Design a protein around this nucleic acid. Structure first.
Ligand code: MG
Ligand code: MG
Ligand code: MG
Ligand code: MG
Ligand code: MG
Ligand code: MG
Ligand code: MG
Ligand code: MG
Ligand code: MG
Ligand code: MG
Ligand code: MG
Ligand code: MG
Ligand code: MG
Ligand code: MG
Ligand code: MG
Ligand code: MG
Ligand code: MG
Ligand code: MG
Ligand code: MG
Ligand code: MG
Ligand code: MG
Ligand code: MG
Ligand code: MG
Ligand code: MG
Ligand code: MG
Ligand code: MG
Ligand code: MG
Ligand code: MG
Ligand code: MG
Ligand code: MG
Ligand code: MG
Ligand code: MG
Ligand code: MG
Ligand code: MG
Ligand code: MG
Ligand code: MG
Ligand code: MG
Ligand code: MG
Ligand code: MG
Ligand code: MG
Ligand code: MG
Ligand code: MG
Ligand code: MG
Ligand code: MG
Ligand code: MG
Ligand code: MG
Ligand code: MG
Ligand code: MG
Ligand code: MG
Lengths: 139, 394
RNA sequence: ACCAGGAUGGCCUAGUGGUUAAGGCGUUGGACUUAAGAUCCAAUGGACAUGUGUCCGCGUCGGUUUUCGAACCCCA
RNA sequence: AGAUGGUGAACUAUGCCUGGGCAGGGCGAAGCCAGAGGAAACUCUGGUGGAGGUCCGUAGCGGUCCUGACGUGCGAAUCGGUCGUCCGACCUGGGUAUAGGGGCGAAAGACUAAUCGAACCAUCUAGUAGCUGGUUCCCUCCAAAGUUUCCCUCAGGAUA
RNA sequence: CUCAUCAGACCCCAGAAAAGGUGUUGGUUGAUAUAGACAGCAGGAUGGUGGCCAUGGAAGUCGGAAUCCGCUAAGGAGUG
RNA sequence: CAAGGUGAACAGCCUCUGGCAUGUUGGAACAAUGUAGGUAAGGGAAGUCGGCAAGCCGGAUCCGUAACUUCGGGAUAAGGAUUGGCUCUAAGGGCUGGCAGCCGACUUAGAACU
RNA sequence: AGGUAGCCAAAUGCCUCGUCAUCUAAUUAGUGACGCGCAUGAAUGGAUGAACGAGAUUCCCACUGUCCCUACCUACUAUC
RNA sequence: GCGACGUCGCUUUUUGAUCCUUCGAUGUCGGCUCUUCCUAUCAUUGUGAAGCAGAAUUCACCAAGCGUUGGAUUGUUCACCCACUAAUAGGGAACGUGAGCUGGGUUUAGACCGUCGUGAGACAGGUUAGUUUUACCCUACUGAUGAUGUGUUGUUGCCAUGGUAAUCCUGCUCAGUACGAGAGGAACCGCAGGUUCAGACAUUUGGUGUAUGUGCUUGGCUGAGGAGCCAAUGGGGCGAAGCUACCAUCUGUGGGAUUAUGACUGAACGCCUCUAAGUCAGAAUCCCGCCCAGGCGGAACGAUAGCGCCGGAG
RNA sequence: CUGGGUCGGGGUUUCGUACGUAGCAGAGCAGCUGCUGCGAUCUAUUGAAAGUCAGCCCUCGACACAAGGGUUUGU
């Protein structure tokens, strides 16, 4: 999934995946991009006919369908920070957002933008500490 | 020609005779291996699936991100009244297998266990063991029984004990008891036989057989779901919407040459009512029954050290489709097989447990006792009446 | 692949029955003009794609090579 | 397949004669009225008006897609939804006209009584077939050829 | 004669080659042998010479041309 | 030949007149697989040859309407707002003897409350 | 007569998934060009072009069980 | 690690060659689905060898246990590209699989263009529209009654046989350590999770919903109120139970003989030698366990109605 | 002297405050000399009403029922 040099001791629990390939999510940062079109998700080996799918915190490959013209017609890594599919935390508590949202990152994990609009899930925030630094509200 | 994209097969072939279970009570297919150095104990027990609830507990798992954090875990309640021991059966080893050598039944057998020996208790004159019971009141009869025990200690290698459930303490409509062989593990055959001879006609609680935070095995029969197709039975892909003669099928059931149908292809048939042995179910609680002390009815089964309430394990309106749990019960982690009111076999583990999830110590904080017959939102009726106040019903 | 052809001055084409190497353009030399084109007077050149056979004698006829172009390669 | 003589336009194709029928809405052609403007020519505005092989759409007429239902059917072509058109090269009854190498065709070799790249009926006719299929009791005795030559000969004959 | 952790087992005939084996069995040819061998265990490895020629220097000890003597049981102007 | 309601309507839905007995059988259960309908979290064509099928849209009032054009259209282009129930108000007529009296049909607009 | 005006990898171009641009993350598709056009071309009509089309394609917005990934309900069957 | 000039083979996942079977018919391309098999092994387990320092990559052995994906274009097989990944290996099963589907392409009849033909027409040249029938028989398969025998019946059982299952990856730690001039850069043991798969389950979340439960509402109808009904479930909001989703949750496991390989003692062959006699370690393999079924296969026990034991001839 | 079944009662739960009655609450309108009416809606009764096992739980309330019938089986 992440496969990153900067990692916490404890690994992530399985959450519900609500963002398959083809999902257009909000781009919740000031890069100028308004849309992230998911073309695949990191870490998935998959199965026959199964779409790769993403939850919060999982890194995806995404194009920009609407935004500045120097951001489009190319692929960027991105990390989903919000999702409409309700996922169960280990406290048994179910959380969802009203919007699916992500932010454009690089291979190491640094966002291209420098501020995040909207909340960021805890599952994304602890897994990506450079995202949680620019998050305003968390989970 | 080969299939292009590889795809794993649907379903296990290791549960292949996907037929309706020839037993209703789950059979221990293999008991734990006996160690003569261990104290003499029972290895299995027989309970009844009451229902499910969920718990809150803090987790001590260093290295996890849920260390010192409280989880809600699904748990299943198994109402386990004490078993009454009525028989002793011995088994000799043989190059053809394990032969039943001798069976000795107790002097007094209850009517619940007697009902197992009949297909129709009502039209019977209820005569089982009415000539066998004369052995225990005859001096030559005891002089044959003790030589049968001498023959078992001399020749038997395995000793099992016949015990039956106490149906009168259960809210089930059934009053015919379940008999079961339970293999007595422990020391020598002589002392293992003396143990069962003393516990003959006596009752065994679930406390003596099982303990808190131990992984056991749950043996049972799956919920019956009747004749089902391949899409629900073996979970194959549905055919597209344009399919002529039906889309909930399997499109190819074999090539031309093996010129038969293989046993490995998914076919429609019985789904559910399958005998299963799930392993490593953690006992999250062994709760005691409904006690009558000082005239008070003590029923604070679900009152934890973090609750200080007086509530029982029974939720509001009781368990859906079961009844009440007024006997001692086993709270197991997660889901066990079967319907509500289904008999479940609890077996001691066949494995050695050196893992942290197996040796984890469990302290329950909260037991959910909201009604499952809807979206019940109160743990106790005193809480419900305190929140609402007086109604019109006074 | 099969059939039918075609290879000649520097380029483009003639050329038999068997004896004659042809024409246009080009090249070259001299005139005209101040000079150059145009015009006038002239000159040279051909591996006749190769070897073989027929014949006195072949570019020419007849079989085999080596490069090329044209048509066909259909029913399942 | 071929020929001779007949029977069919109760289905359908087309002409003619005589009858019958086609809710409710949309757009709004020309003509017309008034107001305003202009030197005139005329031009803006607001109504009216009710045209059109005009649009949505009912009956009717048709039959696009689901390649849906059915597919030993309800039915030797039907059923459901969705659809094309629905004042005009419209739909339809009855009468009438054209007949088989002929008719009729807004033309698909379509239609011409479940039959059409030549209908149906009877006869010539037991048409011919080097080509498939079949060819009926027993015993006894003898016992092959697939080669030569010729042939519009090569799945057949004649000849040895 | 042959052991196969791929044995083999009868014309047609129903499955195998080049190449290879200190598997094992035979045979052929030539030496190196009781004028005492072959392993194995030790001991000597000599002076002319630390060689002209090259190469800074190479002295048997990078290279090419020199490859003789004697005391000898022996030692190549030296296999590493 | 062709009643009432709703409604633009001979639409559809319900009802009166008149008609009938569910379309060549009844009973019991509610398995698969069908045929005909529905709903589906998150995603929104990634399915598939192909948005096939299904779904979105829909009536009316008030706005608003592009390129193009044969100047007729395109055009219900596209895109918006409103819509219930109740209680009012205003305006739109006729007959008799710039006025009075007597009546009466449906609309349309505005407003308040809910 | 040697194909003019035009048009083009067209429903007409083998080579061919032609080359460039544009559309996409990625396009043997689409559009716009280019023209050497196997084998375009002028009433065997060429080029255009509003309106119209149950005609053939491409992209976008919206919408959805088409799919991820299936599940449940109802009617008539099947069943007895 | 290769390997010219030459030479020996294998295989039938290529095209040919041939015409033996089928022309009183064996449904002709692809894709979807689903099962199984092969190994010429891409990955993962165990290994040996490198011009293997580490990392990465090659070559080879036992090895087919388990995997080998999501898409744009094309009807495509093939191809090519984007992206993920441990890897995105190759194949067979009448070039598996049409009474399984689909019908995009071939390959009927309609029609257009180019080329060819005087013409009718032709084109492994393009283009568009074009009916996919039947199982209730036998077997096989999946489930479901039972059948012979133990006298009859019932309880508890055993297991002969048959099936069989788990998989792989990431993060923390080791460790910026070993290794390396540096650049770079591991691994064993542990710990937490995840993928694919399997078996369940519904406490919770989500879905369904004709408890036709309870409100709301349109049109109509019962004179009105109340109560209802009809509109092939009138529509809609919420909805108990029950079913149900990696769309919620739970569980997934031990040995033995060994392969490749590395070795020990040790001759052959007075040395040496992992082998000849003998012996050891040895793995996603194999076999068993676990798990699923339970034999025209046994066992123990219960109770046995005119029947069971004990002491005449036929 | 016990059992299940049916009804009733509780519990749970589902929706969301039933009919009737009252109100100087109600945009307003009408008729009378403050009253009487119409009036969608609102407020209180009233977390009311209604449903709730048919496959939810508990009653010890009421009622009847339950000691039956057929067919075979012998070592
Ligand atoms: Mg797929
Ligand atoms: Mg494969
Ligand atoms: Mg179909
Ligand atoms: Mg519940
Ligand atoms: Mg003739
Ligand atoms: Mg007529
Ligand atoms: Mg019209
Ligand atoms: Mg119209
Ligand atoms: Mg059809
Ligand atoms: Mg059918
Ligand atoms: Mg019928
Ligand atoms: Mg006509
Ligand atoms: Mg024709
Ligand atoms: Mg013949
Ligand atoms: Mg013949
Ligand atoms: Mg009916
Ligand atoms: Mg009837
Ligand atoms: Mg959805
Ligand atoms: Mg939604
Ligand atoms: Mg697609
Ligand atoms: Mg696809
Ligand atoms: Mg459609
Ligand atoms: Mg338009
Ligand atoms: Mg030209
Ligand atoms: Mg496309
Ligand atoms: Mg173009
Ligand atoms: Mg032409
Ligand atoms: Mg032409
Ligand atoms: Mg045949
Ligand atoms: Mg056939
Ligand atoms: Mg067949
Ligand atoms: Mg191999
Ligand atoms: Mg095939
Ligand atoms: Mg078949
Ligand atoms: Mg078929
Ligand atoms: Mg087609
Ligand atoms: Mg055709
Ligand atoms: Mg049947
Ligand atoms: Mg076995
Ligand atoms: Mg160092
Ligand atoms: Mg639920
Ligand atoms: Mg729900
Ligand atoms: Mg539910
Ligand atoms: Mg709902
Ligand atoms: Mg009412
Ligand atoms: Mg009706
Ligand atoms: Mg071992
Ligand atoms: Mg060895
Ligand atoms: Mg060993």
């Amino acid at each position: 999934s992440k496969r990153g040099r900067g990692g916490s001791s404890g690994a992530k629990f399985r959450i519900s995946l609500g963002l398959p390939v083809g999902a257009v999510i909000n781009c919740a940062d000031n890069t100028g991009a308004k849309n992230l079109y998911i073309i695949s998700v990191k870490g998935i080996k998959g199965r026959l006919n199964r779409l790769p799918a993403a939850g919060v915190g999982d890194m995806v490959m995404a194009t920009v369908k609407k935004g500045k013209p120097e951001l489009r017609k190319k692929v960027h890594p991105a990390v989903v920070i919000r999702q409409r599919k309700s996922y169960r935390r280990k406290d048994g508590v179910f959380l969802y957002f009203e919007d699916n949202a992500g932010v454009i990152v690089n291979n190491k994990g640094e966002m291209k933008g420098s501020a995040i609009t909207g909340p960021v899930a805890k599952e994304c925030a602890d897994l990506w500490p450079r995202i949680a630094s620019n998050a305003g509200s968390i989970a | 020609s080969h299939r292009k994209f590889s795809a794993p097969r649907h379903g296990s072939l290791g549960f292949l005779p996907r037929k309706r279970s020839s037993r209703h009570r789950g059979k221990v297919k293999s008991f734990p291996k006996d160690d003569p150095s261990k104290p003499v104990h029972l290895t299995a027990f027989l309970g009844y699936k009451a229902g499910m609830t969920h718990i809150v507990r803090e987790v001590d798992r260093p290295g996890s991100k849920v260390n010192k954090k409280e989880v809600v875990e699904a748990v299943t309640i198994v109402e386990t009244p004490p078993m009454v021991v009525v028989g002793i059966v011995g088994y000799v080893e043989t190059p053809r297998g394990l032969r039943t050598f001798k069976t000795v039944f107790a002097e007094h057998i209850s009517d619940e266990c007697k009902r197992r020996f009949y297909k129709n208790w009502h039209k019977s004159k209820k005569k089982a063991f009415t000539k066998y019971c004369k052995k225990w009141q005859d001096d030559a009869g005891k002089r044959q029984l003790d030589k049968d025990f001498s023959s078992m200690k001399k020749y038997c290698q395995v000793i099992r004990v016949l015990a039956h459930t106490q149906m009168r303490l259960l809210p089930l409509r059934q009053k015919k008891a379940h008999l079961m062989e339970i293999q007595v593990n422990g020391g020598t055959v002589a002392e293992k036989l003396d143990w069962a001879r003393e516990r003959l006609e006596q009752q065994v609680p679930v406390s003596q057989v099982f303990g808190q935070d131990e992984m056991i095995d749950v043996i049972g029969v799956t919920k019956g779901k009747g004749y089902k197709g391949v899409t629900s039975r073996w979970h194959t892909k549905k055919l597209p919407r344009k399919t002529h003669r039906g889309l909930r099928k399997v499109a190819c059931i074999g090539a031309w040459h093996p010129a038969r149908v293989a046993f490995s292809v998914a076919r429609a048939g019985q789904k559910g009512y399958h005998h299963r042995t799930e392993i490593n179910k953690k006992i999250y609680k062994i709760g005691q029954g409904y006690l009558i002390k000082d005239g008070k009815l003590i029923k604070n089964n679900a009152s934890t050290d973090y609750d200080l309430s007086d509530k029982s394990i029974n939720p509001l309106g009781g368990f859906v489709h079961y009844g009440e749990v007024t006997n001692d019960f086993v709270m197991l982690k997660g889901c066990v097989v079967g319907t509500k009111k289904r008999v479940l076999t609890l077996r001691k583990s066949l494995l050695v447990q050196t893992k942290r999830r197996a040796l984890e110590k469990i302290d329950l904080k909260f037991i959910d006792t909201t009604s499952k017959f809807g979206h019940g939102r109160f743990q106790t009726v005193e809480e419900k009446k305190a929140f609402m106040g007086p109604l019109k019903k006074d």
